[PDB]
């Protein structure tokens, strides 16, 4: 037989279109994939690749604590679920967590200068002086910064050049204007000093110098050198589209250096800081694979961020999901550069996924809040609260996080869902009451675990039984007759027995109701055993206050269910009782 089920197994697999090894691809709570193995359990030979995150600060909760005291959790009134709509984030909240040689440092630092104002310590006389100087300020800082980054490169070349003239040129691609002059005097060159004194300004006069001096030279002369005539092109206001093109200079000096040239000299005060970077793009575009270069392009292209974003994206561009998420949210809700309430949602999912897979649970919840769409914001909040809140209680900084403005109700209900799994039905019911779900918490004592304050209660003093009673005096009585129909049976029971409200009508009302009640939870576990206790108590309670000894209440005793000793006792006692009557002469 055993050998002949090998063969059957094989046929069953082939006809149902299975072959080879079965592998799967179900995402776990760690979000790695578990594939078959020899010593194979659910997962073996993990074919999950490392997380795409590797930014310092994302693995630091020190970062996460800090960002609670920036922007603060809030929800719409449209959906009462978190849907953050203010920002109090800047691009100066991480700058020291990564190196200062790194492109990551450069990316966060640059963005605050570009898009956000760099304010003055005072307030100007007119607002066009306010605003003009504000942009010029951003620009000033930028221009020097670029020079520091490009620094070592230019310096290297200055060192390796042992020609005076050549060193003199190399300096001007920095802001070494000072010292450029200094070397020129010493090396017996007047001509270089004169042109150097004019650096740091551009004018219609200066344009005029550049075009004419070139024409007179390459006509009346025998013609000036290739690179001198290239300089004339930078000063007339078109070096790359100029008659001598500097586009060849990419091939020796970075796209940022090339950008530097137009930015310091050409079209400075005939342009705003915005339009000025754009002009350089029209003369020579920067490479698309630069993460940090793309930023300039976005600023420059103005509120055509969307259009460019899709274009650049379709021409090779790498950016981190942390970066896309943080950028789109801050700028829109600072009103410095508006974004759509759609590009924001795309970015919120992307970073939030990477964070779960990284094993960052606080981070992944925070991020998610900045989601827009009443449904979506809803959807997401629910899910991540539900799956465990033990790690929302892990520290005191995770307490202030989740308790800030994420409805208390959600916290309590999550606890109950976890508690169903634990077999913690006792605490379950309590947490459902608090999560404002009076009807749900009814179901957890009557459909999953009968009251332990009517089973394990001590009958001697009934101390646990009246805890049952008193905690329904702590639960709504302003809206009682909309959630009590299993709990109510408990209520009428408790008032009749505890407090001694023995009325014939009260007795009947409970018994007729309790027949139905018995008839759907005489087969639920625990609940069934508690019904028998209840019955023993009610029967006992009637003798104890005086048995009314009518036909109908005799009836009542048998209409409420009886146990094995009880049905035998009644028949036993009735003959003895008769005997006793006939006893005395």
């Amino acid at each position: 037989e055993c050998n002949d089920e090998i063969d059957n197994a094989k046929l069953i697999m082939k006809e149902r279109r299975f072959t080879a090894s079965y592998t799967f691809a179900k995402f776990s709570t760690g979000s790695m994939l578990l594939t078959k193995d020899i010593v194979g359990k659910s997962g073996v030979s993990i074919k999950r690749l490392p997380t795409e995150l590797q930014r310092k600060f994302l693995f630091d909760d020190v970062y996460l604590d800090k960002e609670i005291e920036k922007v603060t959790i809030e929800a719409r009134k449209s959906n009462p679920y978190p849907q953050i709509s203010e920002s109090s984030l800047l691009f100066k909240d991480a700058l020291d967590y990564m190196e200062k040689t790194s492109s990551d440092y450069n990316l966060w630092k640059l963005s605050s200068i570009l898009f956000d104002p760099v304010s003055y310590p005072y307030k100007t006389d007119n607002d066009q002086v306010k605003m003009a100087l504000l942009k010029k300020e951003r620009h000033c800082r930028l221009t020097s910064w670029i020079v520091s980054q490009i620094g070592p490169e230019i310096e290297e070349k200055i060192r390796n050049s042992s020609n005076e003239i050549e060193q003199i040129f190399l300096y001007l691609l920095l802001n070494d204007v000072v010292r450029a002059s200094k070397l020129a005097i010493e090396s017996k060159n007047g001509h270089l000093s004169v042109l150097i004194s004019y650096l740091g300004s551009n004018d219609p006069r200066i344009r005029d110098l550049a075009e004419l001096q070139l024409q007179k030279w390459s006509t009346g002369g025998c013609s000036i050198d290739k690179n001198i005539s290239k300089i004339y092109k930078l000063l007339s206001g078109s070096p790359f589209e100029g008659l001598f093109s500097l586009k060849e200079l990419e091939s020796e000096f970075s796209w940022l250096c090339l950008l530097n040239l137009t930015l310091c000299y050409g079209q400075i005060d005939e342009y705003s800081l915005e339009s000025l970077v754009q002009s350089h793009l029209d003369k020579f575009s920067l490479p698309y694979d630069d993460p940090i270069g793309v930023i300039f392009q976005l600023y420059a292209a103005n509120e055509n961020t969307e259009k460019l974003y899709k274009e650049v994206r379709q021409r090779t561009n790498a950016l981190d999901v942390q970066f896309c998420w943080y950028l789109i949210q801050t700028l829109r809700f600072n009103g410095t550069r508006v974004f759509s309430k759609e590009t924001s949602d795309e970015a919120t999912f992307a970073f939030a996924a990477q964070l779960e897979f990284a094993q960052l649970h606080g981070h992944s919840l925070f991020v998610s809040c900045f989601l827009n769409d009443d449904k979506a914001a809803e959807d997401t909040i629910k899910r991540l609260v539900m799956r465990e809140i033990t790690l929302l209680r892990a520290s005191t900084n995770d307490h202030i996080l989740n308790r800030l403005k994420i409805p208390s109700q959600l916290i309590f209900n999550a606890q109950a869902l976890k508690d169903r799994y634990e077999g913690n039905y006792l605490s379950e019911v309590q947490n459902l009451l608090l999560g404002s779900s009076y009807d749900l918490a009814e179901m957890a004592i009557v459909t999953s675990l009968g009251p332990r304050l009517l089973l394990s209660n001590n009958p001697v003093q009934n101390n646990e039984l009246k805890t049952l009673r008193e905690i329904l005096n702590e639960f709504p009585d302003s809206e009682r007759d909309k959630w009590s129909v299993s709990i109510n049976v408990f209520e009428v029971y408790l008032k009749l027995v505890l407090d001694n409200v023995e009325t014939q009508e009260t007795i009947d009302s409970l018994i007729s109701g309790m027949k139905i009640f018995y008839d759907q939870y005489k087969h639920c576990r625990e609940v069934a055993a508690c019904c028998n206790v209840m019955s023993q108590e009610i029967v006992s309670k009637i003798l104890e206050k005086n048995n009314p000894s009518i036909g109908d209440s005799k009836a009542k005793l048998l209409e409420l269910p009886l146990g094995q000793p009880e049905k035998a006792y009644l028949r036993g006692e009735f003959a003895q009782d008769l005997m006793k009557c006939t006893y005395k002469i």
């Binding site: 979000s31 997962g43 073996v44």
Partner: protein, 286 residues
Amino acid sequence: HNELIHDAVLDYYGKRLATCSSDKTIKIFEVEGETHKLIDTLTGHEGPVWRVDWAHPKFGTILASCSYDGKVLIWKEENGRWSQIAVHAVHSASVNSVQWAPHEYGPLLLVASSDGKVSVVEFKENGTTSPIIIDAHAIGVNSASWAPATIEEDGEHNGTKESRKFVTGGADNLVKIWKYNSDAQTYVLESTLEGHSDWVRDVAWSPTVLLRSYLASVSQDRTCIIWTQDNEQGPWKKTLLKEEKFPDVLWRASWSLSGNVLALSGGDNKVTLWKENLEGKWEPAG
């Protein structure tokens, strides 16, 4: 131990994991990644364990399991130990899938048989379900799952149209969704999306939506079609995860909890991870 792990899922507290094997046992395990503490064994079925699933917490932690017997024998820990709390058998012909519905959809139990029939019942502790069946495909249903999320009917009466949506996948290369109707006999079929030349294998809907609903319909034609529903209620348009035949025999294709990160289990024991690219098409993240 097991030389072959067919498929294996997790609960909704992420402390337990249930392994579908092929030696007829459902091994309940405790999830600690690669290592597991085997706590239980439930042998009691005929042939390969095709599918098991865990209940959404608010209708137990019930574990409904199907094998080649063509029956769902439901197990439930009553007393801290496994026993049989139910049995089903309205369709026998091998039950392929066996799913529990979202919290709002109820304790609905999705049965999908290879006789071209599909049951949809309710789990009761007082008993009674009304037997409602609707015919999906004709050559069988090799996987079934559950539609995204419940909708809202407005007006004065909610839960009218759409509502609980059932998504199936037969062996006749046809993938489509439903719309629970109450005014036209059987579930009025939506639109037949024929884009398959070999039998449909696994179907998963994305619990992450933007402005379109994603439906990864895998097939044995070595491609996965991604059905982008335009504006979520528009038509279903052709969007291709790969245009070409992979040299991998694809099986499952299940989405992540957040994100449109999709894992596709290749025949060479390599689970590629796909993200949507710079265009509307997909490129691998790994």
